[PDB]
Point group: D3
Chain length 150, copies 6
């Protein structure tokens, strides 16, 4: 497909509350790129501690959302939307590089992940891109993952 | 004076996690109307139970969100943006009428509240409006809440 | 009576949105009496409100809808956990609700719903929420049972 | 003789999700207390105790009796005094003769019945039962120690 | 029957789940005799939000609960060995708790070690006693009798 | 000093539940290095979703933990144990580089943070190091953080 909602995302990723950080897929081009996003609301538990009276979505969780997006891209590229096969795979994330945070993310923001395949050799996938809020780059990162059996 | 962010909301409304359901205020007209919104994400505890495998933002919480929007409008119309006064006030729901849910709200939606003051007298405010997602009415509601000093 | 275990087999709601603990009375297509205990040990109170525990008015209504939901499921298909696991419930309308007394921890929130009208999966009920014999709230609502 | 959650919050230092006393229905200084905690499915504890079979932890029933006994010990000496309450801490040294007879589930009103067995200085020993609708669901003896915060 | 079991194995034997599964690993196990396990204590636990604000103390009753779960694992395990399918139909219940003594407060950063020994077993009835230790020191003492019952 | 417990960490770091991922500091050298750790237990909410029936501590949270240790070093380096000045600040992640995840971290693990100061000037600190479990490197990373006025 091209558009995947939360119910579809749930069938592909093993992630669940409170670590499923991708609400909807707006664009998906097999083996090339994925545009998705996660809404940022105050009503999230992480905001209880990050930080009191100063709600700021954790930079490491922006990268996690990006990794998740990359993982969905990789998986669908190999087997498409296949819930059955999804249950038998795992995407190990081996490395993270060139991460830069330019603007803080906060409640009310629509955190949009933009990832593209940088390299794919065998079970290894290298993805990179940015996270954006209303058109502006809020962060960037590269990630390398390996695909294996669960 | 017309747009407020989560920090400004925290200084006005007494609500807190997991019952602070307004993330940002986009426009505000004293004693008249207010437009605000709350982002809906899967990463909300309410979804563990509503319902398993089928994330649906609870209709009653959409109404709560509209009430809180009215509350913000009510408080600032009264004392303006005054945190020290807001600090010791709570808000009680008095009545709810003519609410209709038209479209289910799910993760990924930007729930936009549109409230207009139908009548107010002292601490008693009567608002009515809609909750919208991508310009479409997903809910209609009318409510009356009371602002009161913690005692 | 129907205890939490039975309620779980019929209603699709789960933590932290399952707000009915026990069903004390049930009369098909007529009325249902049930309740939910209110204790400080509930997450909602962390935010409603700090230093002043007030059970949310909208949750009192949710508790009434669920009570009504249980009446709809059983009136429709009897106590059938199998048919129940395929359905969910949507709120359609809420009207004429009034809150008279705040519900707080230590209260036994009793739901009293009667059937006003029904047709197919669409049920309209109304009644009150009571604490120690006094009406703390009134309400009318219409909900729809659907295939998830 | 009757304290509601706000009063309880001013005396006990416990907070969510460890404040296990909702209301105090009876209190005789140096003698006894009767209080209760409502049990509802809407409690986080039930997610794991246990999945598909909600049962209020027996050790949490004891904790509730401890908190009640500590509330008794404290108010007996200083009464309803929020200010002093902040300068003291009632922790427990021992717990004994505990027995569980009936499982406590969502829908039950868990009533704590503690009495002062003996006390000397800041060391108080209470004991009694946990009851649901008139029946004994548990019994226990505890020895608290009141010290400076 | 092995002597070391990790969380993956504990999850298959005990029915407890978040936030009441209080045993993270088993370091030694001896059928009908004893068990040594532990639970890591971190600030990132919901219980510390209210016990207590600004002064995180791991609840004494939870230390006891942890010892009971250890004894429970030992009991079931001594009887059926590592049998997940059967474990799934049994459940251990507290019958009594006696001689509980709290000696030292447990706090975030501590490794709460459970040392339980079988004082008497007879069918589904098990009486165990032991201590909760932190860095070699006894922080708690307890004794309890449990029952292995049917889940239905 | 050289060792701080949870009560000291609370008075310095702005992080609270569920994002305070450092439990104890075992070694600290002003402007040079720090060794701290966070206990890993199944009794953590994060494990409900990462992942069901297969608890693994999130790699990004391991880095976050290293960042917090660095932040604790940075602050006490410039102000010592000063709770009054500590509450007038937060820390912002600026960059992360060279992170390798070698071994999965699970309940029962004592996640040890080893960080050294690579560069530092003003409120800008650059640290790098590893996260260890029973003396084995389970991860590596470099990061730059900034201590900023709460405003
Ligand atoms: O160690 C694991 N790493 N990654 C799992 C995983 C799987 C997919 Br599919 C994915 O898109 C991503 Br991102 C993952 O992290 C893992 C191990 C077991 C399970 Cl059941 C799930 C995940
Ligand atoms: O320190 C204990 N209990 N409570 C302590 C405590 C609580 C709050 Br509230 C407080 O502000 C402070 Br000063 C305390 O020491 C304790 C003392 C002994 C054991 Cl064996 C276990 C716990
Ligand atoms: Cl950050
Ligand atoms: Cl709904
Ligand atoms: Cl209300
Ligand atoms: Cl139990
Ligand atoms: Cl304790
Ligand atoms: Cl990971």
């Amino acid at each position: 497909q091209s558009q995947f909602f939360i119910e579809h995302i749930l069938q592909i990723l093993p992630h669940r509350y409170p670590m499923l950080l991708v609400d909807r897929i707006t664009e998906l081009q097999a083996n090339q790129k994925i545009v998705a996003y996660k809404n940022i609301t105050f009503n999230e538990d992480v905001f209880n501690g990050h930080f009191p009276n100063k709600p700021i979505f954790p930079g490491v969780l922006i990268v996690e959302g990006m990794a998740q997006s990359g993982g969905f891209l990789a998986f669908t590229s190999l087997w498409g939307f296949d819930p059955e096969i999804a249950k038998t795979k795992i995407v190990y994330f081996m490395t993270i590089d060139k991460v830069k945070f330019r603007i803080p993310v906060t409640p009310g923001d629509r955190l949009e992940y933009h990832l593209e395949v940088l390299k794919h050799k065998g079970m290894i996938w290298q993805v990179g891109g940015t996270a954006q809020v209303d058109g502006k780059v809020v962060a960037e990162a590269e990630l390398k993952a390996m695909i294996a059996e669960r």
